[PDB]
Design a protein around this ligand. Structure first.
Ligand SMILES: [Mg+2]
Ligand SMILES: [Mg+2]
Ligand SMILES: [Mg+2]
Ligand SMILES: [Mg+2]
Lengths: 213, 213
């Protein structure tokens, strides 16, 4: 179906995260406990937001790199629907996270970082993982060159493997067209979805989403 | 001369506090492992900082992105050393090193993923001189102990001027394997706690004296 709107909560305290989530809930589909909030407060953040927003999809972004069986279980038990696992995790860790996700009826999302390869992506799909978080290339962000042909190509390759991407990195309404035809689960933003104009930004994103999906 | 480090990977702070208290007189470095960090948040770092004011304290975040903010949070909480994933973009690693410099702390690179010796040279060029080297997960899966592909990579890293922290089923009888490798710490978990932890620490100390400096 069409791409959903996801807010990444990266506040350094739970009181502020709870305030934001409360303010944005009526117009976001997915609420994410970002890695910053997760380290600031621990699994209490997940449980709290789970209780506050029971009808939202809830993500715990741990970028799990090792101890996957234990971390996956903790996050799922706390109430996460989806959790993130670093692409740099050993494939056995990734499998362990997946085993826990299947036990607990959650899902794994691969956070794409490091010297990752399409061989690696194929191994994720072979474990039955069908979600990845694709960040605008950092080199491109630093250089100011936007979303490059190479990033879009890589996203197309992943989509062709059956991976449903969450796309993130300076996402704004006027760039949505770029992702036409990419298998996209969500668009993820942070501050753009909060505050005075977050509601109108969400609506501007949805308008663009509806043109292309 | 290598120091002895305990990795606290308990899933609650009560248990970690009890373990830290039990082992503190024979370990040099106390580490808030990623598991405990995600379970409890930064209060784990600040609690252990308080309880053990003279130890070197590590916050094992395996930071992959949002490094300036995460690094600050950990150092503010009382960490002396923090870990950053090899999969972090070099700009993130640079951002963590900048905060570490500003807050008189240190960065350690957690070696995961498809990392390269070019990456390692980039870490050294930022002034980073520590990395965490884990016994190959494939070696563990096969049950075969340490292999020369790991030892050789550690010797290459040492030759670039990185002081390794070595972990993965470390036992006293294996310490001889690492002779000649610049080593900051040996890290273990359950082996350093409980009934036999003290005696194991003793043996590890004696083996360390036999091969360093
Ligand atoms: Mg995230
Ligand atoms: Mg058209
Ligand atoms: Mg560790
Ligand atoms: Mg006191």
């Amino acid at each position: 179906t069409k791409p959903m709107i996801q807010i990444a909560l990266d506040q350094t305290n739970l009181t502020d995260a709870v305030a934001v989530a409360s303010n944005v809930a009526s117009y976001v589909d997915v609420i994410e406990v970002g890695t910053i909030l997760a380290f600031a407060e621990g699994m209490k953040a997940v449980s709290t937001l789970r209780h506050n927003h029971p009808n939202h999809i809830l993500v715990c972004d741990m970028k799990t790199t090792d101890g996957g069986a234990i971390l996956s279980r903790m996050a799922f038990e706390a109430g996460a629907d989806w959790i993130t696992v670093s692409a740099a995790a050993h494939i056995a860790t990734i499998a362990a996270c997946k085993k826990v996700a299947d036990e607990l009826n959650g899902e794994i999302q691969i956070e794409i970082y490091g010297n990752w390869t399409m061989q690696d992506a194929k191994a994720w799909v072979d474990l039955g993982i069908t979600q990845a978080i694709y960040h605008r290339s950092r080199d491109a962000e630093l250089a100011g060159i936007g979303w490059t042909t190479d990033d879009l190509d890589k996203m197309r390759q992943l989509s062709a493997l059956g991976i449903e991407l969450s796309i993130t990195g300076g996402i704004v309404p006027e760039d949505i067209y770029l992702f036409e035809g990419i298998k996209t689960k969500t668009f993820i933003a942070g501050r753009a979805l909060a505050g005075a104009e977050g509601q109108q930004t969400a609506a501007a994103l949805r308008e663009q989403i509806d043109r292309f999906w």
